[PDB]
């Protein structure tokens, strides 16, 4: 690893600098180096890891969607043949995206998940595993698409089970997990009713737990609840 010679603390410090500079590829390489030191990650360090890769893969996914829409338009009735370039470049972006997903999944599997015993870390990493299998599923088209989908489902479900037993309904990780598993149901698993049921039940159960919270915790929870509401308004 190109980060093997740098101190763990320096990698974390530089990941925070990269965040401030919106250099998310750098931020992700720094946090990968930090994970590969072999020590567990703190709460703040897990957030740095997730934010870095979320932004890297988020830009790749947006580019892939632009290119895939061009590709699909080029295969409509009446489109002039333009050669293999659109497909080639879509494939190039797709392959780079899959490489990032594989790298994150490899960090989770070696060895973040197996050492995560507290609910907040275990649920967090299983949500990530679900998320990156979901991004693979968004571009999948071959023999293993169903297994990719089921891997996303399985990881989200284990995280859901732990979060329901071990975290209050307003916990931001629990809420963000439910938000994304709902999106998975809606547009990956062809289960819009499940997506709507999960978003509503999650929102209503958080609502009823807000009275237990401090002002700051209230703000943290309501922010993600509003994203659940946004999706319900879009989907109904």
């Amino acid at each position: 690893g190109a980060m093997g010679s740098m101190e763990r603390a320096s990698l974390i410090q530089k990941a925070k600098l990269a965040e401030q500079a919106e250099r998310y590829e750098d931020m992700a390489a720094f946090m990968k180096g930090a994970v590969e030191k072999g020590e567990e990650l703190s709460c703040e360090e897990r957030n740095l890891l997730s934010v870095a890769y979320k932004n890297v893969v988020g830009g790749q996914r947006a580019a892939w969607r632009v290119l895939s829409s061009i590709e699909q338009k080029s295969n409509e009735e009446g489109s002039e043949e333009k050669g293999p370039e659109v497909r080639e470049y879509r494939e190039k972006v797709e392959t780079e995206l899959q490489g990032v997903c594989d790298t994150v999944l490899g960090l989770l599997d070696s060895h973040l998940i197996k050492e995560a015993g507290d609910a907040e870390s275990r649920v967090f990493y299983l949500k990530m595993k679900g998320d990156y299998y979901r991004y693979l599923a968004e571009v999948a088209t071959g023999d293993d698409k169903k297994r990719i989908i089921d891997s996303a489902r399985s990881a989200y479900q284990e995280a859901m089970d732990i979060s329901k037993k071990e975290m209050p309904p307003t916990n931001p990780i629990r809420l963000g997990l439910a938000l994304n598993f709902s999106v998975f149901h809606y547009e990956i698993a062809n289960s819009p009713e499940e997506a709507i049921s999960l978003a509503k039940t999650t929102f209503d159960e958080a609502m009823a737990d807000l009275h237990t919270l401090s002002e700051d915790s209230y703000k943290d929870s309501t922010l993600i609840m509003q994203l659940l509401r946004d999706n319900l308004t879009l989907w109904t």
């Binding site: 998320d131 938000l179 994304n180 999106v183 994203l227 946004d230 999706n231 879009l234």
Partner: peptide
Amino acid sequence: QWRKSL
């Protein structure tokens, strides 16, 4: 709107 994920 693009649906929300986190």
